[PDB]
């Protein structure tokens, strides 16, 4: 018979039960594959007269990398395609559109031994 | 249609109807036609004997 006591002078929206999605059909019905593969992060080795001086002397393995890749996706792509640990990942956007990647390897892993192993020197 | 043919015995009228123009002429029809009419509270207890929701007359 008695009503509910209200200690506050403001009526607000009551918390209701919000249901989760139980859809009748998938939105696109196909799980799309990896848009940026491990073979799509790295795309071209850079062989200039200055990039080869960083391989032999500075222990810097220079790659050309796509525009949709950060420093995270370059480090896990060298460790997967080569099994070579990476200390730092250094990126710059080239003035002609693409992105240059300076990857310095560890002291235990030499950069000249991986250069002639894959084919560019 | 049953009041005009003198076929009604007991007519119930619900006061809960918000479109009141549906129900103002029902005591007027039962007065001239000699039909005894009753006014009951709530159209909700009229839908319990008929298994509906709105059962304004019976």
């Amino acid at each position: 018979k008695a009503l509910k006591v209200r200690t506050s002078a403001t009526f607000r929206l009551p918390k209701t039960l919000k249901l989760a999605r139980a859809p009748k059909y998938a939105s696109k019905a196909v799980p799309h594959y990896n848009r940026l593969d491990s073979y799509k992060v790295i795309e071209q080795p850079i062989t200039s007269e200055t990039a080869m001086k960083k391989v032999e002397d500075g222990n810097i393995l220079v790659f050309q990398v796509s525009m949709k890749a950060n420093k995270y996706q370059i480090k896990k792509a060298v460790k997967e395609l080569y099994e070579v640990d990476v200390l730092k990942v250094n990126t710059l956007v080239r003035p002609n559109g693409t992105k240059k990647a300076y990857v310095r390897l560890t002291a235990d892993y030499d950069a000249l031994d991986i250069a002639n192993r894959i084919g560019y020197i | 249609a049953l009041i005009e043919n003198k076929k009604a015995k007991l007519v119930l009228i619900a006061n809960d109807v918000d479109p009141i123009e549906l129900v103002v002429f029902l005591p007027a029809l039962c007065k001239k036609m000699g039909v005894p009419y009753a006014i009951v509270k709530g159209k909700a207890r009229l839908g319990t004997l008929v298994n509906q929701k709105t059962s304004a007359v019976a």
Partner: protein, 50 residues
């Protein structure tokens, strides 16, 4: 200039790769009416207007 956004720098790459002459094998093709590059842009005369 020298402290810019990516969208302004993005059009500089297209503007740099178009500042070049015709390839040497173009003029030798069958039925070509192209004699020179008429869209050569110079930074001194015609500014790109971003």
């Amino acid at each position: 200039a020298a402290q810019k956004s990516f969208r302004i720098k993005q059009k500089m790459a297209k503007a740099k790769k178009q500042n070049r002459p015709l390839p040497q094998w173009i003029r030798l093709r069958t039925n070509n009416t192209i004699r020179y590059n008429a869209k050569r842009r110079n930074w001194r005369r015609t500014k790109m207007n971003i």
